[PDB]
């Protein structure tokens, strides 16, 4: 799978037609960093986009389902194939960081 | 000058001027001197893009396009056309009158067909009410079109009732009328372009042209209160005019040919608002009921004249210019001849050099004028009579070449 | 930001209404085809007979049978866009 | 004149209307972006197997023949169940019944242009 | 199919916290409750000894829960359930529709008030599709006690004849028809002991579809062209109304 | 079929073609596994063209 | 079936059947119980045996139909380019000029690459030595393609070596040349076969008339040795030419207005071979590949012309049609001016008649003759044919009032 | 030119193209010793049942006429789906589209060697 | 006068044709394949003296053929010829310089010409007078057809 690759920023590309394309296992890369990113009933062409952000980060009690909608999210994905995700701080202010680690369908030929 | 709808019309930017404005835009945005352009991955794409805006804007240029009378060529045509209240006319099956003889007079419904000529069916809607005399019924091709046939007996006896004896009929065809092509629908409809004007001097021409069976057509009203005039027609080519007539005050006047008189009495007695002259006394009736609930007839009768056809002399040189590749009289000929002319219309040499040429032509034309009696030309218009509609025969059309 | 801009622009999701280069370029497909827009709102506005000058009011003459050319001199309505000669009609006229 | 049933507020439906001189494709198209119902037929007579030229994008509106200039002996016009004699323009005009939509028999044309037609 | 399309579409259903019940009528107590999941794997020895595999038909699971419903539940933790947004003007894209007048404009604003009042019924049903009872909601009669909340919200929902979304802990499975419910009442406990069999109703899409699930507002936009059946219109009696007066002429 | 504008009428071209015609461009610009959905940029902005 | 090659081709023999054929052999040899599995030593080399004969018959597959010009992939540089006569232009590696700012002296090893900002991966090709500071120091590519350095990005390296501060590109980098692909170089060595599109008259003006930005253009040859003559052209008129004319011994000669000048060159270079007459010379430029990856410039001269000038006079006489009113002598010369011609047409008078009637005027030409300047006044054909861009302009038309 | 539908991975398979003027045996090989597709053809003519001499052992290229020589009015020829025009040389080269085989109709070899044929 | 008369329209009358016939072409032996390959193995040449040859031998209906070429400024002289078997030569003619000439007998004199117009780059000579017209659109977006006349 090809998908124009996104600079630091996350602004778009263009120019280098060909060029500005990931490759591999890091176009799987950069589809799973912005899944997680879509929001669900923004996209009026996909209204279950994604994992449906404004009523989980509104909500209380809801980690367990923020995790198991992300792994939906990862999982779902042309090119991974299992995940090993947790949370690895607890809210230091307000906000949680979460770890996220898969193992793309690449690194498997052995 | 992109996509500008200005007082010069409609000027939709040529695929180049679309393709700078994306890659300029594109340019900005991204890069000022460094995303490439052409022949390029990312080049294709902006074409791919301005395939699809070009796409809707030649769109544009094709709709305006057919906001044009003169060019519109198509349904447009026709919903241009609905601006006023005229449409194409259809298509109307060939009448057929014959005489049939059957030994008893019953009952006859829709089956029949006849003339195996031509693989054809004329089939009818009517009984038959005398007895083994030639009594005449109508028959209707099955073919609409300009479909006729010759007087032969070659009936196929489709389903007969008894099937009594040949049916050969006099010899008289009416045509029927092929599907209006547009062609002839652009001249129609620019020239009854004042259709649902109810009896004014166009209103007579738009809904006569309407007929089933008209051909040419003119209108002409004396508005004044002298007589002997002519202010209103039905083309403005001759309201130059200054040429005798013998007519009377606020009276109209309709020269027709070819429509039945039950149909253009209809038309002239629901649309006419004065004196009438004619010859031809086309009629009208209509059923009216009294406030005391009764019923009657009114008789309209009012009067039409059909033209006095005649003929037209043409004095043409022509001079081809090839070294040994003379001119084909026969061909000029048959072009010269095939001009349709309206009702009474000024033939002037200034239209019908235009007529004589064809389509690969070798020929100039340097002396060409027209004449009414065979001689004396003169070297402009002249007149065919306000009733008079002309042609130009194959025989009368004279072409003089010059050798080179 | 006018109204075509504004609600076409919510179909850019939102990993992508915020990044600059991003937002214009989807602006610039949208103005793209916003030109089109306008257009098609705009010709009834500038076709009919009021708000018509020069080769749209000629075409109108052709749809009505009605050519500038009347062949008579009027004189000129003095109370530039476009001049004809002396025997035809200035545009207000016709 | 006769009424065409099943219209549905789904945007681009098609109904083979089967009568008597020969049969039509009613492609019911609805504009959204601008509220309007396109039409379009393709009217094969009944005595060929090629069908006539298509007609193409007209709009469904109240009291008006819709395809006269084609010159085939059918058309369609709608009225409003209303009088607010407003031209269908929602999705669902055909389903509640606000409008609905007339398919004007041969026979009907016969009274409407006066004369026959192929 | 394929082995890769287990695990995608087995996470496809992900339990939310706030544990809807049968479909939001979550004030019961889940004495028992089962999925069953069947496979036809067709009998004899498969033919080739090389390539002669997918033979395993997958097939509808359905899902069992027998609970009790008494006129005091008290439940334990768990989350409010909140209304669903309308999320139908998500993609309304005006703007584009023509200029016209007023009172050309208010006649469409009668008209859609006019059909509003015979339409948005429906419209709530299919915005709350899945989830029934904020559809029927909270009965809000104090007459009614527990059980008649519970009998008259299952009546609703076995009469409504459209698919509810049921969950058993660890899944929330999407669209379950109600199979069969059989409420009993012992005569030595005032409850009632019910048995309620749901069949899920899988249905994949067979045609080209870019979009899997647009809004309301883009969802007729993009439908592909559907299709119905001929008719004949000429052999109509329930609408033959006149042709209109203005057309005799015309 | 797709959008022709001839003697005929008008014939609109729907959505679902309008974006396989696109897609299958990009597919000839740039290469036949390029991911072109909800997320992806061509993706994007394939859907916003063929809106 | 088993291996044929005969006038039917080659008939590669499939595993089974050559195994097959393998055993029932070993068993006519030894005897009909040989163990012949995995294990057996005799198992053990039917199968590499057979394994042997159908990898080999594959790579006698791969020779014949390699051997076909047609079909073939790497000696298709071989089989048909150095036998066909074509070249497979070898590839090349984009070289890249690049500052590199170092702390510590040290040698860069052989192959460490860094990255530029589109993951492209460029490699020094060999050891180098970099100094206390910055090092303009030349990366190849990794990708033997087209490969664009744009200049002024950020380069992350992929084999990292201690001591780099700032990888920075001044300049950008000279592409490599990609391969003709090898879809593309048949297709190239195809396109020799079939014959060309047009004649080799019509060829010129077919493929020099999509050039962006022409509107009119003609081309007369002279292909007989006769010098001044003309055999053939682009104008159906010239048939006899009836004027003398100055053009080259045995030569082509093109008249364009309005053209892309560098692009009319390129045409011409494309189509051509031989003498071209005219006054502006116009060249394309080509580049020819030496063996070794080097450029040799060749510049293509031909020579153009390029007229404007043709003042068409026309003079006329208005009769009118009502006594009093006037005609317009104003807009007949702008409908007449409206009306443009080709290069080098024979323009013709009895056409221009035409050319002079206004929508609805009481106007009526006669007696319209056409002069170039002289007074000559010819009735038709007042143009010679070379160099003819002509046409009216509003200050020309002589027209004459007649009042009625 | 229209697609030869189900080509698959596996190494030796035969297609039976059934056409107008008879029809043929694509038997399709693939070498991977060498990494090429050979085809095969037996096109037995509409109007007989001993089928025309074989072809045996082409390979399959992009844009290009294969049984051309061999004067029966088809043959086929496979384009790239990428740009890379390489020849068909993986065995699953086929099944995901990289590069697709397309069956030239009798009617497009007329407009190919501008004449009928057998 | 032996018709089989199939599904006829009507079955009019019988319809005797004058004698003369088109032989009609066998597919092409390999024997004969060798001799005109290797005889015109410059096809691909497009206009060059053995590129008239070999796509003219291509003609439905040519059955022998020559082809002459005149390249020095020199008149009455031959120098480029289809088959070098003349080139020895010294034996007399008449042609102009720069000049071609194809000699040809059984092709179609449309397709003779189409293949002459499309392939000649000088002067002609010869007495049959093939033609050839070719479709062309002007700049301005016009029709036309030009006349190649050649002998």
Known sequence: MRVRTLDDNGDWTFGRGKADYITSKKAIAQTVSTRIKSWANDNPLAMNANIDWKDLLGRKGTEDTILREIERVVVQTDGVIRVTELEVIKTEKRVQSILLSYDTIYDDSE | ?404 | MSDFLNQYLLYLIKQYYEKPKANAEAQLLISTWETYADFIANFGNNFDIDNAEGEVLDLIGRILDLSRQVNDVIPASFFTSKVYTDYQLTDTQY | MNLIENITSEYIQTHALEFSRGFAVLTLIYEQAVQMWKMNVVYTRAGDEEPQPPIYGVKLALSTTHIKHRNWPFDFTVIDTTNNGMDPYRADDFETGRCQLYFITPEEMIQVRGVDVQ | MSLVNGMVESLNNTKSETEIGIGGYRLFARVRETVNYRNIVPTDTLEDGSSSTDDIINEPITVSIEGVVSNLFVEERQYPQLVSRDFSAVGEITALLPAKSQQQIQRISQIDSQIRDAVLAAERAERLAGKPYEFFGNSGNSAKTEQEKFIDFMEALYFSRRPTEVSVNFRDYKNMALVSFIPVRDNNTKDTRFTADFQQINYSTLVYTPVSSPSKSVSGKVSDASNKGGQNPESNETGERSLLSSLVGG
């Open chain 2, 1 to 404: 000058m992109s996509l500008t709808f200005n007082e010069n019309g409609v000027q939709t930017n040529t695929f180049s001027e679309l393709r700078a404005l994306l890659e300029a835009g594109y340019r900005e945005i991204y890069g000022t001197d460094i995303v490439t352009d052409q022949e390029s991955p990312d080049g294709q794409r902006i074409n791919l893009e301005t395939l699809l805006r070009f796409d809707i804007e030649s769109a544009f240029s094709w709709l305006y396009s057919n906001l044009d009378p003169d060019l519109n060529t198509g349904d447009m045509q026709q919903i241009i056309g609905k601006l006023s209240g005229l449409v194409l006319l259809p298509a109307s099956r060939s009448q057929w009158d014959v005489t049939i003889n059957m030994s008893r007079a019953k009952t006859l419904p829709a089956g029949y067909t006849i003339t195996d000529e031509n693989n054809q069916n004329w089939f009818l809607d009517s009984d038959v009410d005398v007895l083994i005399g030639d009594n005449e019924v109508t028959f209707l091709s099955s073919l609409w079109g300009s479909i006729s046939g010759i007087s032969g007996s070659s009936f196929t006896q489709a389903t007969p009732e008894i099937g009594v004896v040949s049916i050969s009929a006099s010899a008289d065809a009416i045509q029927g009328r092929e599907e209006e092509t547009p062609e002839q629908f652009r001249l129609r409809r620019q020239r009854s372009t004042e259709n649902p004007a109810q009896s004014t001097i166009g209103s007579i021409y738009a809904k006569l042209a309407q007929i089933n069976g008209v051909t040419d057509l003119q209108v002409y009203d004396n508005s004044s209160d002298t007589p002997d005039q002519i202010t209103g027609s039905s083309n403005p080519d001759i309201l130059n005019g200054s040429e005798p007539v013998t007519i009377g005050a606020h009276t109209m006047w309709v020269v027709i040919e070819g429509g039945s008189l039950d149909d253009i009495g209809e038309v002239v007695a629901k649309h006419r608002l004065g004196n009438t002259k004619g010859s031809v006394q086309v009629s009208y009736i209509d059923t009216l009921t009294k406030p005391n609930g009764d019923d009657f007839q009114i008789v309209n009768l009012h009067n039409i004249d059909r033209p006095v056809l005649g003929d037209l002399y043409v004095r043409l040189t022509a001079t081809q210019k090839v070294s040994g590749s003379p001119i084909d009289t026969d061909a000029i000929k048959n072009k010269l001849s095939l001009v349709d002319f309206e009702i009474g219309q000024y033939v002037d040499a200034d239209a019908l050099y235009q007529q004589s040429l064809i389509t690969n032509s070798n020929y100039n034309v340097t002396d060409l004028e027209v004449s009414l009696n065979g001689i004396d030309w003169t070297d402009g218009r002249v007149f065919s009579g306000y009733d008079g509609k002309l042609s130009i025969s194959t025989s009368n059309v004279t072409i003089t070449t010059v050798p080179v």
